[PDB]
Design a protein around this ligand. Structure first.
Ligand SMILES: CN(Cc1cnc2nc(N)nc(N)c2n1)c1ccc(C(=O)N[C@@H](CCC(=O)O)C(=O)O)cc1
Length: 123
């Protein structure tokens, strides 16, 4: 099972970017999904998570009100809409899956991890 992140690249502060998460296989179980990000020298940090059915979301305090997480269970995609970007925000973004929604925001929670997509925000 491979998680594959898309949509990373070079963008401008105050811009928008959409990332997406895809999977190499479908599962018969309902998974909670998350995005995490990791800047040059730091820990992988929580960004957003979403319950199996798309009903529950929670956001890391630094992106709250700016990023929207949502999912399309038909196409099997997870999306991260990133509005009002800042130079901080520059990071490798990773999509992940977790068998429950409680642990999904905890670094050791997720059972599956993407290889990551580079987002760079200039001023
Ligand atoms: C976490 N997940 C990927 C996954 C799940 N839900 C999604 N949901 C959405 N909306 N978007 C995705 N990209 C998405 N990706 C998985 C997890 C396990 C396996 C897997 O090893 N296959 C087994 C394990 C799970 C099972 O027993 O059903 C299988 O038979 O399906 C597949 C994908």
């Amino acid at each position: 099972v491979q998680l594959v992140e898309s949509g990373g690249g070079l963008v401008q502060a105050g811009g928008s970017l959409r990332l997406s998460c895809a999977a190499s296989r479908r599962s018969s179980r309902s998974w909670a999904m998350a995005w995490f990000r990791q800047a040059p020298g730091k820990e992988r940090e929580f960004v957003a998570k979403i319950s199996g059915d798309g009903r529950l979301t929670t956001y890391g305090d630094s992106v709250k009100g700016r990023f929207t997480i949502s999912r399309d269970n038909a196409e099997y995609l997870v999306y991260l809409q990133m509005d009002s970007l800042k130079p901080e925000d520059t990071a490798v973004y990773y999509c992940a899956a977790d068998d429950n929604y409680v642990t999904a925001s905890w670094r050791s929670g997720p059972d599956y991890w993407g290889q990551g997509t580079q987002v760079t925000v200039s001023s």
